[PDB]
UniProtKB/Swiss-Prot annotation, chain A:
Gene3D superfamilies for the chain: 3.10.440.10
CDD domains recorded: Ribosomal_L31e (cd00463)
Major localization listed first in the record, in broad terms: cytoplasm
Record-level GO cellular component terms: cytosol; cytosolic large ribosomal subunit
GO BP: cytoplasmic translation; regulation of translational fidelity
Organism lineage string: Eukaryota, Fungi, Dikarya, Ascomycota, Saccharomycotina
Protein's UniProt keywords contain Lipoprotein: no
Protein name: Large ribosomal subunit protein eL31A
Highest taxon above the source species: Eukaryota
Subcellular location: Cytoplasm
Key words, A-Z: Cytoplasm, Ribonucleoprotein, Ribosomal protein
Known role: Component of the ribosome, a large ribonucleoprotein complex responsible for the synthesis of proteins in the cell. The small ribosomal subunit (SSU) binds messenger RNAs (mRNAs) and translates the encoded message by selecting cognate aminoacyl-transfer RNA (tRNA) molecules. The large subunit (LSU) contains the ribosomal catalytic site termed the peptidyl transferase center (PTC), which catalyzes the formation of peptide bonds, thereby polymerizing the amino acids delivered by tRNAs into a polypeptide chain.
Molecular-function GO terms, alphabetical: structural constituent of ribosome
From Swiss-Prot, chain B:
SUPFAM superfamilies (alphabetical): Translation proteins
Function: Component of the ribosome, a large ribonucleoprotein complex responsible for the synthesis of proteins in the cell. The small ribosomal subunit (SSU) binds messenger RNAs (mRNAs) and translates the encoded message by selecting cognate aminoacyl-transfer RNA (tRNA) molecules. The large subunit (LSU) contains the ribosomal catalytic site termed the peptidyl transferase center (PTC), which catalyzes the formation of peptide bonds, thereby polymerizing the amino acids delivered by tRNAs into a polypeptide chain.
Organism: Saccharomyces cerevisiae (strain ATCC 204508 / S288c)
Keywords recorded for this protein, A-Z: Cytoplasm, Isopeptide bond, Methylation, Phosphoprotein, Ribonucleoprotein, Ribosomal protein, Ubl conjugation
GO CC terms of this entry: cytoplasm; cytosol; cytosolic large ribosomal subunit
InterPro entries: L3_arc_euk, Ribosomal_L3_dom_3_arc_sf, Ribosomal_uL3, Ribosomal_uL3_CS, Transl_B-barrel_sf
Gene that encodes it: RPL3
Protein's name in the database: Large ribosomal subunit protein uL3
Pfam families, per database record: Ribosomal_L3
Compartment(s) of residence: Cytoplasm
Disruption phenotype: A mutant confers resistance to trichodermin, a trichotecene toxin produced by plant-pathogenic fungi.
Entry's family note: Belongs to the universal ribosomal protein uL3 family.
Length: 109, 337
RNA sequence: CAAAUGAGAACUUUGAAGACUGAAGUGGGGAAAGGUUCCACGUCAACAGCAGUUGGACGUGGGUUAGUCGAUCCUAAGAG
RNA sequence: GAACAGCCUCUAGUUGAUAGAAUAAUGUAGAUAAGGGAAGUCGGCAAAAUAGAUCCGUAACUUCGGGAUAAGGAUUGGCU
RNA sequence: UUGGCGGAAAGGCCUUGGGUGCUUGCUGGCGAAUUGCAAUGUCAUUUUGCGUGGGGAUAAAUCAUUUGUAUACGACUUAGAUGUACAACGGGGUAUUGUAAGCAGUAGAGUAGCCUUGUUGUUACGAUCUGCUGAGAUUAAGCCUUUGUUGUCUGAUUUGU
């Protein structure tokens, strides 16, 4: 019963979206978070929470936050599962600031 | 590695800056000692120089076999394995090849390779080249090569200060370029239909072809260039703190600027500071070659003593040479309690 | 962004966010014109210069209620 | 705000225009530029500069009505 | 089997010796027809194979990922199966800006009174000023370590001397 890990990460959307056209910054932030989850858990099937979408779009197209504290939980697919048995769910985690935070495993307990 | 600035007294008897200090741009080339792994002999033929054989070293560096590979990580690392099996005897197939190089091969060159692991680059793939030995008989040259097998030659052995050398490098690439910047053609007037960064007339009616001498768009940069007459301003030692320290400054500081050379890093190895610019960009392999003639010019024969070397940050407008000087100017700070 | 529907969803629906028109509007009605395009119910053949589960498309149906709103009556330039 | 001008927002409506990736040249649209300032060019074409309001000041000429916002100067916020 | 010599494109030359076969150097014995009167009348060569034997070692490239010293796309410098390797975050260095929020001040032009009979009693405020505070924020996206945390490391195609 492995590959069910949940980890807290900090993603630097600043370096991610440096030099991007203003009308594509929040969509590109969504795609960069998908790629970040894929690089850190190997799962193509990345599902973003609507609250994380709200965090990304909090300040319009070009107002994506500099650093985002995400909670990526790799889970197991079900209900007519897709090609990949595993998928990642990316959630927003509320912090006062996203600075000074290191990636940390969280457990179901 | 990058460019920096020096201050030196200028000595040409007759200039209005004679015995007056001058501020000069210099280029720093980080030169860790290169390993001599192998030699090749060239017999002269009525079709040019033709290599007759190459004799390699017994143990080759991991970086040099990486040079020989492409997907190095997913490899059996079988490279020069049977050559080293040929080795481990006295001269079973080795003394014979060296003897062939002596008997023939008027021109003999040593195969040398860089220490990319010493250089701050992330390459791990050494640069393998040939260097021609230019003295003595062929027997002397091949004896030199065989004696220097698996040995590291430092640049202070070959290049001296106040010396004119040539830099051979591939210049910085700039992709596809228009004719206006690729050739420096006059821009067309503002009221030009269909663009103005072009050459207006690319040929007459006859000959009914575009000639090779007409300027056209295409690749700019990434060209091989050999620029001559660069004066070596310093041959500094990596195993030496206060590299950038001179008899005028006497401050214990290294040539590496504040925050490190931009896009490159540090110069923890031996280095050369040459005057002016050289072809190629930072992080790029360059070849430093001895002059092909005897240049006096009353400029090649100039004795250069450096009075000061700029080690301020190149990542902006750095006002300080050393962290101690920065702390001395700014006093105590909030971060350091 | 998620969910639903669906064989199939960048485009359908529903939530959530970000926006826009900014009251001489991208809003609510009408005149000429169109003629059923209105509205409900079913899916890929065509059409919607990508797609389509959607549609002003396709098939089948339903829909327009006046003594008071208009016409009808009057005369205008004019026609006869 | 002088203002159904330009900007932002309630009501209402829309989120429709094939998309994804990358960011070569040349384009289209929009900008900036040392020092010089029309030397460019048929030609100051194009662009720039000017600009609202208050106060001061305002010539030649004149059909006495104008020219005139002539030209030319200064000020402008917040708070008590 | 023994010396070599030959690098211009050497790929050729004798020998030192042992074994074997012909010898037209000089003389004999047998055979040849009939392919019919000629018919080129068939005699020498960049490759291989279910195959046989005198013997040998079990490699890479490419796609996918990455990289940015490159780049329109291809190409091009790079990295990636346990390394002081790579990557995502965090301190440092570095740099850019200019002194953050909050709290406090008998600071601040001033506007309205108390009575316990006027050298700090105080309130409803008040742009700004001062202190914490060269602070705070940003810092590679084409500047470094994972001495800190956390993860990654056997996926697909082709190559005949």
């Amino acid at each position: 019963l492995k590959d069910v890990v949940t980890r807290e990460y900090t993603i630097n959307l600043h370096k991610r979206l440096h030099g991007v056209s203003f009308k594509k910054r929040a969509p590109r932030a969504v795609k960069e978070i998908k790629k970040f989850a894929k690089l850190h858990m190997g799962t193509d099937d990345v599902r973003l929470a609507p609250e994380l979408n709200q965090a990304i779009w909090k300040r319009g197209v070009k107002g994506v936050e500099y650093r985002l504290r995400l909670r990526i939980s790799r889970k197991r697919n079900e209900e007519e599962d897709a090609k990949n048995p595993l998928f990642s769910y990316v959630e927003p985690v509320l912090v006062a600031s996203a600075k000074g935070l290191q990636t940390v495993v969280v457990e179901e307990d | 590695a990058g460019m920096t600035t020096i201050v030196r007294d200028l000595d040409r008897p007759g200039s209005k800056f004679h015995k007056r200090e001058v501020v000069e741009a210099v280029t720093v080339v980080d030169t860790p000692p290169v390993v001599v792994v192998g030699v090749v002999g060239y017999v002269e033929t009525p079709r040019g120089l033709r290599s007759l054989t190459t004799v390699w070293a017994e143990h080759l560096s991991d970086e040099v076999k990486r040079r020989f590979y492409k997907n190095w990580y997913k490899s059996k690392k079988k490279a020069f394995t049977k050559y080293s099996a040929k080795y481990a005897q006295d001269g079973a197939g080795i003394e014979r090849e060296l003897a062939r190089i002596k008997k023939y091969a008027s021109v003999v060159r040593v195969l040398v390779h860089t220490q990319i692991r010493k250089t701050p680059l992330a390459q791990k793939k050494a640069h393998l080249a040939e260097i021609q030995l230019n003295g003595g008989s062929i027997s002397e040259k091949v004896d030199w090569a065989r004696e220097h097998f698996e040995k590291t030659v430092a640049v202070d052995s070959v290049f001296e200060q106040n010396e004119m050398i040539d830099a051979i490098a591939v210049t910085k690439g700039h992709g596809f370029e228009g004719v206006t910047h690729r050739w420096g053609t006059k821009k067309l007037p503002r009221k030009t239909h269909r663009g103005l960064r072009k050459v207006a007339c690319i040929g007459a009616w006859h000959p009914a072809h575009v000639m090779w001498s007409v300027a056209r768009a295409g690749q700019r940069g990434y060209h091989s260039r050999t620029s001559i007459n660069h004066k070596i301003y310093r041959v500094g030692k990596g195993d030496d703190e206060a590299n950038g320290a001179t008899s005028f400054d006497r401050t214990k500081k290294t040539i590496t600027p504040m925050g490190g050379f931009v896009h490159y890093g540090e110069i923890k190895n031996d280095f050369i500071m040459v005057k002016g610019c050289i072809p190629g960009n930072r992080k790029r392999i360059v070849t430093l070659r001895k002059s092909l003639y005897t240049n006096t010019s009353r400029k090649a024969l100039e004795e250069v003593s450096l009075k000061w070397i700029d080690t301020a940050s190149k990542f902006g407008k750095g006002r300080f040479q050393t962290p101690a000087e920065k702390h001395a100017f700014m006093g105590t700070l909030k971060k350091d309690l």
